[PDB]
Scaffold this active site. Sequence first.
Site, PDB file in Angstrom:
ATOM      1  N   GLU A  59       1.204  -1.427  -0.426  1.00 56.16           N
ATOM      2  CA  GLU A  59      -0.003   0.079   0.180  1.00 56.16           C
ATOM      3  C   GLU A  59       0.924   1.652   0.205  1.00 56.16           C
ATOM      4  OE1 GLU A  59      -3.249   0.023  -0.499  1.00 56.16           O
ATOM      5  OE2 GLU A  59      -4.159  -1.591   0.432  1.00 56.16           O
ATOM      6  N   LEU A 109      -9.555   3.652   2.116  1.00 50.72           N
ATOM      7  CA  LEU A 109     -10.298   4.050   1.332  1.00 50.72           C
ATOM      8  C   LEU A 109     -11.423   5.016   1.970  1.00 50.72           C
ATOM      9  CD1 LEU A 109     -12.380   3.278  -1.277  1.00 50.72           C
ATOM     10  CD2 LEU A 109     -13.604   1.850   0.367  1.00 50.72           C
ATOM     11  N   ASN A 120      -6.943 -20.066 -10.919  1.00 48.56           N
ATOM     12  CA  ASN A 120      -8.416 -19.343 -11.077  1.00 48.56           C
ATOM     13  C   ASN A 120      -7.893 -18.050 -10.563  1.00 48.56           C
ATOM     14  OD1 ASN A 120     -11.879 -19.742 -10.321  1.00 48.56           O
ATOM     15  ND2 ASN A 120     -11.337 -20.828 -12.030  1.00 48.56           N
ATOM     16  N   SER A 135     -12.831 -19.525  -6.549  1.00 45.70           N
ATOM     17  CA  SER A 135     -11.383 -19.642  -5.724  1.00 45.70           C
ATOM     18  C   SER A 135     -11.228 -19.510  -4.755  1.00 45.70           C
ATOM     19  CB  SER A 135     -10.463 -17.953  -6.620  1.00 45.70           C
ATOM     20  OG  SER A 135     -10.538 -18.233  -7.802  1.00 45.70           O
ATOM     21  N   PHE A 156      -8.693  -6.164   2.882  1.00 45.35           N
ATOM     22  CA  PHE A 156      -7.557  -4.597   3.371  1.00 45.35           C
ATOM     23  C   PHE A 156      -8.266  -4.010   1.437  1.00 45.35           C
ATOM     24  CE2 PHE A 156      -4.802  -0.942   3.591  1.00 45.35           C
ATOM     25  CZ  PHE A 156      -5.121  -1.429   5.194  1.00 45.35           C
ATOM     26  N   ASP A 205      -6.664   5.200  -5.459  1.00 51.88           N
ATOM     27  CA  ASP A 205      -6.705   3.887  -5.025  1.00 51.88           C
ATOM     28  C   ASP A 205      -6.108   3.184  -6.541  1.00 51.88           C
ATOM     29  OD1 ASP A 205      -8.973   2.692  -5.872  1.00 51.88           O
ATOM     30  OD2 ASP A 205      -9.010   2.267  -3.679  1.00 51.88           O
TER      31      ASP A 205
HETATM   32 NA    NA Z   1      -2.112   2.555  -1.718  1.00 48.85          NA
END
Ligand code: NA
Length: 164
Positions: free
Chosen positions: A11, A32, A132, A117, A104, A20
Site C-alpha cells: 500500500e 479507502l 483461478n 477461488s 484489506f 487507489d
Molecule cells: Na495504496
Amino acid sequence: MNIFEMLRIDEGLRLKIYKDTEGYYTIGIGHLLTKSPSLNAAKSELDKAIGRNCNGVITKDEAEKLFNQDVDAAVRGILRNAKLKPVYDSLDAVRWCALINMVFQMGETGVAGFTNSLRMLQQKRWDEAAVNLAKSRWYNQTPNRAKRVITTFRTGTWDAYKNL
Ligand code: NA
Ligand SMILES: [Cl-]
C-alpha cells in the site's frame, strides 16, 4: 513477515488524498475514503475519520492509526463472513495473511464474491486456486500485487515479498 509489514509494502504511504489502484479516493496506507466519484464525499469522510478539518491531508501517526483500524476491520470481516470464515479455517499463518491482504484491498463483500477461488482455497487446492485467481479482474487491474498475493497463497511462503 507479518500482515502489517506485507500491507505496508503493498500500500505504501501517502499523506494527501489519492486514487487507489481501483480508482477510488483513498489516503494514508490504503485507507479507502469512498467509492463515490465525488472528491467532496472523500473529504467529508476523511474529516469524519480523523475527527478534525483535514483539508485532505493527514499526518504519519494519523495514517498508522487508520492502518491499524483497517487491518483489524479486515481480520474481523473474515471471521464474521460466512463465506470467508470457512476459508480461514483452511489457511495457515502465511496463507491467512494473503486473505487478509485481499480483504484489506477490496473489502469483505468483494472478496466473499470470489466463489470458486474461495472454494479451492478452502479445499487446500493451492495451485488450482492460484491459477483461478489470475483470471480475475482484480489480477488484471493490479497484476504486480495480485501476483505477490497469489504466490503467498500458492506456496505458503514469503518468497514474493523477500526482495522488492
Ligand atoms: Na495504496
Ligand atoms: Cl502456521
